[PDB]
Amino acid sequence: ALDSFTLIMQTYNRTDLLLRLLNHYQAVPSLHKVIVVWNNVGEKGPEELWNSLGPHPIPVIFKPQTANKMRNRLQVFPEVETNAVLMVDDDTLISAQDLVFAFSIWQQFPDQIIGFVPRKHVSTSSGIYSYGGFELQTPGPGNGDQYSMVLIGASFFNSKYLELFQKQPAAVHALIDETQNCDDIAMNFLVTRHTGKPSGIFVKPINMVNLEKETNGYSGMWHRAEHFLQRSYCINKLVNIYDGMPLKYSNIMISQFGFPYANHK
Amino acid sequence: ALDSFTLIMQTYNRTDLLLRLLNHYQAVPSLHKVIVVWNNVGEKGPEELWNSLGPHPIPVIFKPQTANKMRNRLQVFPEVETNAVLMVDDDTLISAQDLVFAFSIWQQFPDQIIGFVPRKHVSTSSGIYSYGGFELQTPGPGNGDQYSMVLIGASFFNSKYLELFQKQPAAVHALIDETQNCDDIAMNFLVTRHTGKPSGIFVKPINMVNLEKETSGMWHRAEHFLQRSYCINKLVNIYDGMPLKYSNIMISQFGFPYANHK
Numbered sequence: 001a002l003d004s005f006t007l008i009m010q011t012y013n014r015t016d017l018l019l020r021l022l023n024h025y026q027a028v029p030s031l032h033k034v035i036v037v038w039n040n041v042g043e044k045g046p047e048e049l050w051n052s053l054g055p056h057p058i059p060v061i062f063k064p065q066t067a068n069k070m071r072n073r074l075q076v077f078p079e080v081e082t083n084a085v086l087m088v089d090d091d092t093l094i095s096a097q098d099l100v101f102a103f104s105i106w107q108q109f110p111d112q113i114i115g116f117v118p119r120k121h122v123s124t125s126s127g128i129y130s131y132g133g134f135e136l137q138t139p140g141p142g143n144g145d146q147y148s149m150v151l152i153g154a155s156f157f158n159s160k161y162l163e164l165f166q167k168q169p170a171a172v173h174a175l176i177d178e179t180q181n182c183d184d185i186a187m188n189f190l191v192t193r194h195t196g197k198p199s200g201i202f203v204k205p206i207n208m209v210n211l212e213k214e215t216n217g218y219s220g221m222w223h224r225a226e227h228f229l230q231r232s233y234c235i236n237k238l239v240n241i242y243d244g245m246p247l248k249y250s251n252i253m254i255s256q257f258g259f260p261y262a263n264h265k
Numbered sequence: 266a267l268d269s270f271t272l273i274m275q276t277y278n279r280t281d282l283l284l285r286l287l288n289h290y291q292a293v294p295s296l297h298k299v300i301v302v303w304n305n306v307g308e309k310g311p312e313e314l315w316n317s318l319g320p321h322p323i324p325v326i327f328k329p330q331t332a333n334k335m336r337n338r339l340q341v342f343p344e345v346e347t348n349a350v351l352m353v354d355d356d357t358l359i360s361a362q363d364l365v366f367a368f369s370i371w372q373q374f375p376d377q378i379i380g381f382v383p384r385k386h387v388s389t390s391s392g393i394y395s396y397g398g399f400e401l402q403t404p405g406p407g408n409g410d411q412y413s414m415v416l417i418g419a420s421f422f423n424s425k426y427l428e429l430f431q432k433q434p435a436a437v438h439a440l441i442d443e444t445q446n447c448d449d450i451a452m453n454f455l456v457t458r459h460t461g462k463p464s465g466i467f468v469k470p471i472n473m474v475n476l477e478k479e480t481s482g483m484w485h486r487a488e489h490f491l492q493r494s495y496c497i498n499k500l501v502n503i504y505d506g507m508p509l510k511y512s513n514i515m516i517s518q519f520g521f522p523y524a525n526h527k
């Protein structure tokens with residue numbers, strides 16, 4: 001339970017993709033337990049099939065959910081006995097090498113969101129914010145780019161945030177349910193307000209693959225027409241609810257010294 | 266004005282090279298002052314020529330030294346008014362782009378040495394240490410490499426560490442003088458013992474170059490490296506323990522060069 005993390009993977013109409021990723025994550029070092037947040041209402045969980053294929057390196061708890069909400073994976077699960085939580089979308093495969101190193105980074109910055117997918121917010125109209133990535137001009141000062149968020153769907157964060165999240169303003173919970181989007185944007189707001197530091201630190205993945213297309217079922221949430229537009233919306237809504245833009249920019253990109261070999265020179 | 270830093274450059278029989286680098290560093294953003302530790306005992310400082318070619322962006326102070334000692338640059342200079350000190354050998358050209366970034370990193374970790382040249386110690390026979398770089402097997406766990414030191418000769422570190430150095434066991438001073446080497450290793454020992462964290466944080470230089478040749482160099486001397494190992498062991502003895510701590514963190518600027526995150 002000490003020096004270990006808990007994998008929280010929410011899955012929706014991607015059971016085939018899920019079983020494949022589960023075979024991967026179960027074998028990662030420092031993994032204490034896995035919590036599958038089953039969002040397939042009225043659909044028989046896979047646990048049975050999962051046991052017939054045992055033994056497994058660690059315990060895997062399949063929690064059926066009331067409704068299919070993006071927030072479900074943010075509840076305070078009693079079976080989480082680790083200080084750190086590893087949250088991954090059920091369509092992403094992060095190499096063990098990336099997890100071990102990133103987790104070791106999280107331990108040096110437990111109060112921050114350590115992940116592999118960085119994003120930013122920009123502003124052009126005094127007070128009006130927009131959501132985006134490196135395709136948008138750097139809001140930042142001089143050189144390079146900046147990021148003010150790390151998406152929780154590929155990250156390590158202190159499990160006490162799930163608690164802190166629950167204690168957040170009702171309007172925020174409402175906002176997440178109303179859109180079934182921007183739950184990670186909320187978490188980033190929540191974290192930075194709590195620490196006063198950038199909500200996250202970006203760890204460049206040496207081997208992370210997205211399996212979106214390799215699945216029977218839905219194409220994926222970010223392909224919806226109003227996805228991005230919906231995200232810019234959320235940032236502005238949160239600024240209203242919290243009455244202020246808390247996100248702070250950062251341009252720190254951490255890579256593993258010497259992995260690959262001689263990448264320092 | 267913790268929004269600026271002071272450059273401390275020690276020069277020796279490299280005036281041509283010094284005058285060149287000076288033209289570069291004087292223009293670096295957030296540079297408050299430059300302190301040239303003139304280690305040429307007997308020769309006249311470039312001050313006159315320097316001013317004949319002014320005006321310059323910042324005050325440059327040439328401080329003639331009594332003797333030619335490596336540790337001269339680790340003295341507490343009254344003219345240093347910044348919390349940060351940028352220390353560069355007089356044969357190394359670090360781009361402004363790198364300085365500006367590295368400085369911004371130091372501000373987020375003022376108690377650590379933020380620099381572009383990482384090195385480490387290793388141990389094969391319990392207790393005996395050896396000095397080296399990436400040519401030596403990783404001491405740590407099992408992936409990639411590890412560094413336990415960041416050479417001060419191209420780094421950013423808190424100015425309060427120069428005063429803290431003066432208060433080190435006499436033996437430490439003797440050692441530095443004795444070998445005319447190891448000052449940077451002594452500093453790493455000092456900082457790690459003080460903060461309890463890794464002595465430094467490595468920032469990958471995007472554009473740093475060595476002009477050593479264009480001017481012959483200390484590390485070329487036959488007993489240079491062997492001496493450095495020696496120093497780690499002597500220091501370990503003077504401190505009754507090996508404080509240096511391994512780190513595998515490599516910091517690069519997000520988006521510099523463009524899309525280096527993908």
Ligand SMILES: O=c1ccn([C@@H]2O[C@H](COP(=O)(O)OP(=O)(O)O)[C@@H](O)[C@H]2O)c(=O)[nH]1
Binds near residue numbers: 014180
């Ligand atoms: O209606 C939905 C859509 C998605 N998800 C899950 O929420 C995460 C993110 O969804 P997706 O990969 O589609 O996000 P995207 O990458 O497309 O924004 C994944 O763990 C999904 O299994 C969910 O629980 N309900």
Ligand SMILES: O=c1ccn([C@@H]2O[C@H](COP(=O)(O)OP(=O)(O)O)[C@@H](O)[C@H]2O)c(=O)[nH]1
Binds near residue numbers: 279333335353445484
């Ligand atoms: O006897 C000496 C040798 C060197 N230096 C200076 O100390 C630093 C490091 O020396 P060098 O570049 O020769 O070190 P190397 O890269 O060869 O180990 C530089 O600022 C030199 O100007 C000095 O002051 N006295």
Ligand SMILES: O=C(O)[C@H]1O[C@@H](O[C@@H]2[C@@H](O)[C@H](O)O[C@H](CO)[C@@H]2O)[C@H](O)[C@@H](O)[C@@H]1O
Binds near residue numbers: 135151222231
């Ligand atoms: O809301 C997101 O930012 C969203 O981004 C998805 O990523 C893709 C990226 O893989 C592709 O290269 O470019 C797209 C547009 O620029 C987009 O950034 C990510 O997969 C998804 O999980 C995120 O929610």
Ligand SMILES: O=C(O)[C@H]1O[C@@H](O[C@@H]2[C@@H](O)[C@H](O)O[C@H](CO)[C@@H]2O)[C@H](O)[C@@H](O)[C@@H]1O
Binds near residue numbers: 490493
């Ligand atoms: O003692 C040092 O570590 C010493 O290293 C010098 O750097 C050279 C490097 O430029 C060359 O490529 O490889 C050498 C090892 O074979 C060595 O690392 C550096 O210039 C000097 O300042 C350092 O004190």
Ligand SMILES: [Mn+2]
Binds near residue numbers: 220221
């Ligand atoms: Mn996805």
Ligand SMILES: [Mn+2]
Binds near residue numbers: 356477482483
């Ligand atoms: Mn040199």
